[PDB]
């Protein structure tokens with residue numbers, strides 16, 4: 001297939017801007033109808049409505065719903081879609097010409113989109129008691145890491161998927177597999193970083209708007225929507241809220257290279273932001289019923305509330321020590337020292353732990369104290385002059401080479417710097433050094449996880465962890481603390 | 493019943509120390525057996541095992557379990573209690589002599605306590621779909637108050653109880669009904685405060701250790717345990733973890749005076765502390781099956797995670813404004829003012845909102861600026877001298893009359909004070925005033941809610957809301973901010 005392979009590479013070149021909200025096709029495990037709200041007129045029908053119910057879709061567009069499903073089910077749809085906002089709709093079931101259908105409904109641009117998901121008898125009390133077990137296990141978690149492990153364990157026990165991973169999204173948009181629960185004889189993926197380019201902006205927005213994303217078969221033929229454009233608005237149908245939505249061929253190829261054919265992702269949303277994802281993968285095609293969809297949907301909602309709760313508690317817990325460390329340091333700031341900055345040199349370990357760093361360097365006059373893993377003293381000496389040329393009290397930068405061109409000589413040692421200085425003319429100040437993030441990541445050919453790691457290792461060169469608000473508050477508070485005793489010596 | 497009424501009043505005098513973990517009796521809606529772990533020997537049996545299964549309890553103590561329930565169910569108990577920790581036990585059912593039994597099991601001091609709860613056929617898919625509806629509704633909540641209202645609405649829709657209330661426990665142990673969802677033609681209870689004496693320490697500890705407390709009938713005759721003391725340890729049985737536990741007669745009388753006969757409380761626990769309670773009440777006797785117990789148990793676990801998450805977010809959101817207000821104030825601290833404290837007088841509203849207060853009073857030399865709802869200037873003038881006699885930088889007190897005897901003259905106006913002063917000799921400082929909590933509470937004869945309100949109104953006299961850690965941090969930060977520019981004027 002030279003023609004197909006050549007056309008495929010066109011999509012690979014332009015993947016960050018491809019419209020995935022309007023694929024024009026749906027996955028084959030169901031039908032999609034567009035209905036006008038008053039009259040339930042057929043505007044767009046799927047192309048698999050000929051292999052199911054045996055209705056030719058060419059002339060099936062433009063008639064009423066009762067002609068394709070029966071008068072009774074058409075009236076049922078009339079009743080359930082009569083000004084209900086389609087937020088709380090019970091489980092509907094239909095049986096047209098001997099096939100089992102589940103009805104889902106939503107509204108997209110003054111049009112009723114109705115999905116008829118096929119339920120197979122082969123796929124078809126304990127779940128009610130299971131939910132309590134899971135909630136108690138999640139409540140019993142003390143640390144965030146233990147919460148991740150128990151969550152992946154429980155979700156794999158429920159779904160039976162061969163792999164379950166939890167991805168966290170960092171401050172720069174990159175992803176990190178923090179938890180993993182996989183079947184035996186399968187590749188391990190913990191501690192793997194993929195770039196933000198792997199999940200485009202449209203995919204991120206759809207994940208933020210949709211709690212569940214199900215791909216029951218990677219090797220699937222997309223079913224076109226007939227007609228391709230909506231007759232009412234002369235535009236393509238917005239499938240952003242539909243479960244039967246076509247998957248991009250790039251992601252299907254990526255999943256096939258990962259050895260998975262069935263995927264099930266639960267979005268994790270905190271404060272309206274995508275904190276991460278729960279990705280479930282299976283080697284063989286798998287179909288998830290409604291009884292398992294709602295249980296996994298409840299997992300993401302419970303986990304998001306629990307993760308948000310335990311993240312803020314750790315935020316407060318970490319910076320209570322910052323206040324204690326700041327108050328503790330403020331005492332040695334006036335203990336038998338001609339210079340204020342000579343006091344913190346006695347406890348270098350307490351200085352680094354205040355903000356979080358690997359090396360600190362105290363500068364005074366023509367003398368530099370090098371503590372911890374820090375650059376050469378001639379490098380720190382040269383760094384200080386340019387770094388206090390702007391006159392800022394505390395200067396923070398997690399990408400030194402972006403603004404300091406000679407800063408690439410010590411990317412491994414010091415890529416993030418925190419400043420502090422005083423308006424007195426004599427050379428002074430302390431410098432914190434934060435190392436590259438790549439050095440703390442250890443993980444064991446076009447679209448593969450081993451290739452996304454290489455792209456992350458190139459896109460995240462010379463970038464340290466971003467200085468937290470508490471980290472810049474601790475430096476700002478210590479500067480005012482160092483200014484108080486330094487300016488008190490002005491009297492004497 | 494003069495003898496009963498006289499003996500009842502003895503319990504009312506001593507209610508804060510009555511042992512409720514060892515009542516020696518169980519509620520009649522079930523049986524209680526104590527079993528030795530190896531041999532399943534009967535040590536303690538309930539007294540209603542004669543009205544059910546027709547077995548005399550006098551000689552029934554000291555034999556094996558199979559003699560009372562059958563060999564098959566005895567072996568079932570053997571299997572399910574064979575080193576399982578009794579944490580994750582499925583729903584067991586038995587049918588002895590034509591009665592339906594549900595088996596619950598736990599361990600109390602090297603003894604297997606087994607409860608045979610009676611299930612009535614008269615009392616005996618939608619719940620699975622209901623849980624998702626509830627979780628989505630709870631996730632859709634934006635404010636804490638809206639969360640409370642949606643929670644009480646949903647729990648009343650589920651259980652059908654005639655009343656549902658949410659109690660929050662304050663810093664001093666008092667309770668407050670913050671949410672209410674009641675049936676028509678019933679007394680309203682929102683904004684009612686009951687003292688900490690209403691719920692003793694033992695009851696609070698049991699609620700912290702038990703998620704659910706069910707009293708299906710207030711007018712119930714306690715069923716004694718025969719024998720009354722455990723033969724193994726020569727002590728009474730610890731019923732702290734048993735659902736079939738006797739209710740104190742004081743609480744039964746209190747519930748009868750409230751017009752409720754069936755009660756169902758779900759404990760709300762955050763960080764291992766009892767944040768509050770979800771109390772459900774019914775006018776007529778009601779029995780809750782296991783299918784409804786686990787659903788309500790899931791409510792408290794989800795609500796506790798959500799309340800804890802949204803409380804910390806509001807904690808951070810409130811004090812981000814404190815940092816902004818502190819930084820904003822620090823700018824006017826050096827804007828054309830001979831005295832540092834003369835600058836904050838121009839924006840009294842920004843001063844009060846920094847910590848949360850109703851009146852502020854700026855003191856300098858022989859002149860006092862009275863702003864907001866504050867005491868008389870002669871009272872503030874006299875207050876300042878004693879209040880800075882200790883030399884503390886910032887003095888906080890939510891009970892002024894406890895340490896300032898002449899402070900009862902303005903309990904309504906200023907009962908909580910926040911201090912700030914500088915080591916300079918001239919009289920200086922700002923004073924924040926926080927009013928009594930009783931003035932902001934408006935709610936429309938021995939054990940009644942209208943009487944617990946009176947006890948709270950007496951026990952909480954002259955007590956303001958406790959100064960938060962941010963409130964004392966804002967005053968401490970402004971003192972250092974006021975010291976910087978004041979001590980900078982020492983140079984010039």
Ligand SMILES: *C/C=C1/C(=C/c2[nH]c(/C=C3[NH+]=C(/C=C4/NC(=O)C(C=C)=C4C)C(C)=C\3CCC(=O)O)c(CCC(=O)O)c2C)NC(=O)[C@H]1C
Nearest residue numbers: 015016194197198199203247248250251265277279449452
């Ligand atoms: C520029 C476009 C590209 C692209 C598009 C794309 N990706 C997704 C979904 C992905 N892709 C993920 C990539 C990974 N990186 C890893 O390290 C691993 C495994 C360890 C994976 C799978 C990824 C995590 C997601 C989100 C899935 C989830 O769990 O929710 C989409 C969305 C497709 C959809 O139908 O939802 C698109 C359009 N992928 C590329 O590789 C680049 C070329």
Ligand SMILES: *C/C=C1/C(=C/c2[nH]c(/C=C3[NH+]=C(/C=C4/NC(=O)C(C=C)=C4C)C(C)=C\3CCC(=O)O)c(CCC(=O)O)c2C)NC(=O)[C@H]1C
Nearest residue numbers: 507508686689690691695739740742743757769771941944
């Ligand atoms: C000194 C002993 C006393 C006492 C004992 C007692 N109380 C409870 C449980 C209560 N009592 C509550 C009191 C209320 N205050 C109010 O304003 C309202 C109504 C608006 C009530 C009901 C209260 C809230 C609880 C907790 C119930 C819940 O919802 O969980 C117990 C525990 C009994 C048990 O079996 O659990 C005891 C021992 N009550 C008194 O009034 C004083 C004399």
